[PDB]
Amino acid sequence: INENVNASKSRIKDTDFAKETTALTKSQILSQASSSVLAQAKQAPNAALSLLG
Amino acid sequence: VAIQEEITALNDELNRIAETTSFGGNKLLNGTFSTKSFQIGADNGEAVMLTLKD
Amino acid sequence: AVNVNTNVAAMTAQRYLTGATNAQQTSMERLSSGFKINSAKDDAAGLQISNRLN
C-alpha cells in the first residue's frame, strides 16, 4: 500500500521537470520579447518631438 | 474466461476512443464526420474532400 | 494652390501616419503577447475555435 500511495501522491503533488523546465524556458522568452516591445514602445512618443515639438 | 473478460474491456476501450476522439467536439472516428471538403484554393470550388470512416 | 487655410497633403500624411501607428500597436501587442488572436477583433472565428481547442 505504502509504495502505491507514495506513487499516487507523486502523480498529484510531485512536479514533472520536463514540463516545468519547458514553462521556465517559455517564460524567459516571453519576458525577453515583452521587454524588447516595451523598449520600442517607450520610444514611440520620441517620434512626436520630431514634429518640431 | 479471464482472457475474455480482459478483451471485453479492450472492446469497450476501442468504442470509447471512437466515440470520444474529437477535433474540438467534431467527433472524428464515430462516423458522424463523413466526407468534408477543405477549400485549399483562393477561389471557390478548389477544395479536397476528406472521408473519416467509422 | 498657394492657399494658407487648407493643407490636404498634410491631412493625407496624418491619415497614412495614423494607419501606420495603429499597425505598429497591433504587431507590438502580438509580439509581446505571443498570440495573434488576442481580441476577437483579430479573428472572431479564430477566438471561437481556439477557445474550444484550448
Curated annotation (Swiss-Prot), chain B:
It is found in: Secreted; Bacterial flagellum. It comes from the Bacteria. Residues 1-20 form a coiled coil. Flagellin is the subunit protein which polymerizes to form the filaments of bacterial flagella. FlaD is not essential for flagellar synthesis and motility. Heteromer of multiple flagellin subunits including FlaA, FlaB, FlaC, FlaD and FlaE. V.cholerae is able to differentially regulate the flagellins within the flagellum maybe to produce flagella which are particularly suited for motility within a given environment. Belongs to the bacterial flagellin family. This is Flagellin D. The gene is flaD.
